[PDB]
Amino acid sequence: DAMTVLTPLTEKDYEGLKRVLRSLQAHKMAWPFLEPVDPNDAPDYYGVIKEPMDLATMEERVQRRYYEKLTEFVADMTKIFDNCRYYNPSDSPFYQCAEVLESFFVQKLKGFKASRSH
Amino acid sequence: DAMTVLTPLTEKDYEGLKRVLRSLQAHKMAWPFLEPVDPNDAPDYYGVIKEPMDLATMEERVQRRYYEKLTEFVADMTKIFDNCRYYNPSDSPFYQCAEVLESFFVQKLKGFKASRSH
Amino acid sequence: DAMTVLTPLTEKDYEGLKRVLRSLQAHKMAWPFLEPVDPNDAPDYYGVIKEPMDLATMEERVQRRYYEKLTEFVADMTKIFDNCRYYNPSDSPFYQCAEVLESFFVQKLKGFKASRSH
Amino acid sequence: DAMTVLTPLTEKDYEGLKRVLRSLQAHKMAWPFLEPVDPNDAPDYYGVIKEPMDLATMEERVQRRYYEKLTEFVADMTKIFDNCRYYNPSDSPFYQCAEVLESFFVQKLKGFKASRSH
Amino acid sequence: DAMTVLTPLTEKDYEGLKRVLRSLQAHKMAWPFLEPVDPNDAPDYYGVIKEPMDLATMEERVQRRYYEKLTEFVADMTKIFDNCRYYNPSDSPFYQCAEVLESFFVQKLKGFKASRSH
Amino acid sequence: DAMTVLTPLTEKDYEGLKRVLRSLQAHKMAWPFLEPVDPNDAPDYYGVIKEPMDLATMEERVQRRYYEKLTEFVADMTKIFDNCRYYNPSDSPFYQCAEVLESFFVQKLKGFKASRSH
């Protein structure tokens, strides 16, 4: 979509970004992405993931208006999952929780790209 | 079913394992993972992706009958697309090809799991 | 076709002209042509394109009844795509989008050069 | 296609860049694109057209091994057809010859894009 | 002057017009402006100058009694020198020739205005 | 003058180039040239004038020591006036302001050429 790349993010938009973000935080499968990875559960995590991400941190950025474009937002989200699938094994819960939450996200994202324009 | 996990791969199994692979080798979108990553293109690749995977390397492995359970061949397949979304940017052509191939694989693999049980 | 050049435009015709225009304004790939180019996007545009055109300026015209023959309407349409391809790079979005819609409008117009003879 | 944008043009490539070019110089409708637009035919042309092109200027460029990728060769071909539809009227001969000849180039170009994959 | 704008040109007017014009055609430096710019000298000229002009085209216009007010005769003359300084480099002879000739025109034009105001 | 063409610009030179440029911005008739032309005032301006210019861009350039010779500096100035006279009517004020200011600059420039040598 044109507008996703090009049309910048208004106060209205950011309002509905917080709305989507909260939906993720209340999701049943979000339990592994609400906060940052603990370096004690996994030394080498921050050493082998170049750009880690969580919803705790995406909440900061949505409240600090970090994202000039809907594009910078959908990147940082997809980090959460691409990073989770990369570091964990295909048969782990952490992986499954990411596959589920990403599908959900896309739906909650599809509704936001639609409600922007018409 | 997941007799995927438990039921060793027989010879007729390895049949559609090779056929499913030819079909990924055909795809117009398979080009990015037909062969191993060249480290002239990307020096730091091999140092930052832990278990690289191509389809050439995987095709060898279907010839050595490297795989005792279907579980193993699908781990190694999904490596390719997880490595790719990890290493590249989301709006990348590579990243789009992994998104598209994998969905293909998944439909071609859905077929295989059913043409094993009944 | 003879009918397009000499037989002029009935009150009917002008209904199925506004109806095709409508169809182009729906399309997914019509987004770059629904209104006039902005001069702040492109300060040289209006000085180097001799006859710009948009579906908004064309809805005005179809309504005002500006077009005596069908030849006139299809010119003003084709300005939109030839101007685009001229001013924008072959490999660009705007360009690709013009390709999609000229291809479409053609068939949506083949269906009008046929509802005007039987 | 990935190969078109990224694979550098070998000398075998260039051999049958000359074939595609001469097959176009042969065409029955290629006649108005063989040589540069004459300033006496159209005093404004070279002022109102930012980058003119022709098959002769491109025969020179294809001989002097000027094109690093296939991407650059098709860009200059489609200039001939974009500059033409832009400058001339939709109902002019020159305009139809670009319609006819580009459409043909496109097929010669399909056949060369697959002569390369293998 | 009020007269130059408002007082229509009569026959004795048009006779001073022709005297002024020939004085210019005589000038040591009128040479670049005696006739239309040749598109073979400068392919882009006619496409990048919206209203070219010459002392020849104007001598026709003075014979045809084309000018209703002195205002329009002066306008078309200042086109010659404006279009020349615009198109050409300032250190060029054509640029210098317009600088000189116009200053000449101006003294001759002054004369003509008081040869009128009585 | 020899010195204007050949003798590069010292730090002292540049001091008095800003001195002159200031004087221009002081002038009551500088008002149409103090900053760049607005594309919304005039959509075609930037597409049909090839090298625009303004005292604001010229201040930047004098502060970046962009001009090796007094010759480049005086060109860029004279764009402002030639561009104005070309795009606008002889009888317009923008035109009449270009005239007045250009005459001024010449005088201020006369004095700067003279303050260089003795």
Ligand SMILES: CN1C[C@H](Nc2nc3c(c(=O)n2C)CCC3)C[C@H](c2ccccc2)C1
């Ligand atoms: C901080 N801590 C991070 C956890 N999330 C996570 N930890 C690791 C990886 C990973 O990919 N993720 C997504 C790879 C390495 C370790 C979720 C966890 C949690 C535990 C119990 C009840 C709810 C939540 C809290």
Ligand SMILES: CN1C[C@H](Nc2nc3c(c(=O)n2C)CCC3)C[C@H](c2ccccc2)C1
């Ligand atoms: C062998 N060589 C490997 C390339 N594939 C690839 N290169 C890189 C990454 C990646 O993720 N991939 C999948 C990240 C870093 C660089 C594809 C390339 C190729 C070019 C044109 C037509 C087909 C194939 C050939």
Ligand SMILES: CN1C[C@H](Nc2nc3c(c(=O)n2C)CCC3)C[C@H](c2ccccc2)C1
């Ligand atoms: C009005 N404004 C005009 C744009 N269209 C356009 N702009 C330019 C060219 C061109 O060829 N086109 C078609 C070349 C020069 C710049 C479309 C744009 C738009 C942005 C976001 C979402 C929808 C629409 C809005």
Ligand SMILES: CN1C[C@H](Nc2nc3c(c(=O)n2C)CCC3)C[C@H](c2ccccc2)C1
């Ligand atoms: C050199 N001269 C150029 C002509 N081609 C051309 N002239 C013009 C435009 C244009 O778009 N084209 C393509 C717009 C402005 C005039 C073709 C002409 C020719 C005549 C007969 C047999 C072959 C060739 C040769």
Ligand SMILES: CN1C[C@H](Nc2nc3c(c(=O)n2C)CCC3)C[C@H](c2ccccc2)C1
């Ligand atoms: C017809 N042809 C036109 C020339 N004049 C001219 N050519 C150009 C520009 C321009 O500004 N001018 C005034 C800019 C673009 C090229 C003068 C030329 C001539 C040469 C020698 C002796 C007398 C006449 C005759």
Ligand SMILES: CN1C[C@H](Nc2nc3c(c(=O)n2C)CCC3)C[C@H](c2ccccc2)C1
């Ligand atoms: C930025 N904006 C540019 C204007 N200057 C200008 N605009 C145009 C042309 C031109 O030639 N000039 C010199 C032709 C095309 C439109 C002057 C204007 C202004 C208005 C009031 C008080 C001071 C300044 C400011």
